[PDB]
Every structure is written in C-alpha cells, then in structure tokens.
Structure 1
C-alpha cells in the first residue's frame, strides 16, 4: 500500500525522476524510470515539510538540484 502523490520535478531528466509515495505515516522518495517503473534507489522520510527543507537545502537550481538529489539517493547509504 504505497499511494502515489506527485513527481518531485516539473520535467523528467533522462526518463528518470523522483516519485513520492505515502508509505503509512512515513513518506517515500523513489528514483524511478518513468516508462517501466524500475527503481534504482529509495530513501525513507516522514514529513513533507522536512523533505522540502532537505530538498531546498540541496545545492543547485532546478534540474541540477534534482540531479544532485538523484546522485545522493542513487548511491548506497552507508551503515
């Protein structure tokens, strides 16, 4: 049960974007290929306010900022 909310950008980059799912009281951000749904990395979040404070805290402006977001999520999170 992961209800879709919105894509994180206005434009897709290379058929790649960040989808936003509501996973219970948490909230999900998956790096997905838009034509077939293959995820290449996700990260857990809880509130949309802190998610936007994290996203707008990234360096960049627009598609460069979501490039930074997909490079951040698309690496393996360290133990």
Structure 2
C-alpha cells in the first residue's frame, strides 16, 4: 500500500524524499535519507493536491527538499 517514488531531481549528498500513501486515503510522509531520520508527516485527501504540493514550491529539485520537508515537518512527529 505505502509505496511512492522519491521527490528529488539531482543527486547530492544523498538527497531524496520517500513518500507513502494509504490504501484508504491519501498520505504524504516526507522521509529524508541524508540525516537518516524521517522528518515529515502530513495527512492529505486527494492525490491531485498531493502532487501539486511538491509541484510549485519556490525550490528546485534538491532545493525542494529543504522547503517541502521543512513544511511537511511543521507538525510534530510520532
């Protein structure tokens, strides 16, 4: 169920964001690899907004990792 591609462009210092979706509803969990500790948790509803989120940010590729993660990580973690 929880199987999504990474959210990055280039490759520098192992920059990538692993996402995960639920079979029931849409889920967006920004998991980093650089630090080795997933720092992202969010709850979505429609897949449309899911992509739109990572598509439009002021960041670019690897740069979107510091912006997106910083956003999805806004809320506390489990």
Cα 1:12/1:31, change in 2 over 3 Å: farther
Moved more, 35-44 or 2-11: 35-44
Which residue number corresponds to residue 24 of structure 2? 25
Q: After superposition, give the CA deviation of every residue in 1:14-37 in whole Å (9 maximum; x if it has no partner).
A: 545322212123222223243897
Normalised by the size of structure 1, how large is the TM-score?
0.64
Q: How many residues align?
A: 78
Cα 1:75/1:63, change in 2 over 3 Å: same
Q: After superposition, give the CA deviation of every residue in 1:2-21 in whole Å (9 maximum; x if it has no partner).
A: 42121122446654532221
Cα 1:22/1:33, change in 2 over 3 Å: same
Q: Using the alignment, how far apart are the partners of 1:71 and 1:36 within structure 2?
A: 13
Q: CA deviation at 1:43?
A: 0.6
Q: Using the alignment, how far apart are the partners of 1:69 and 1:53 within structure 2?
A: 12
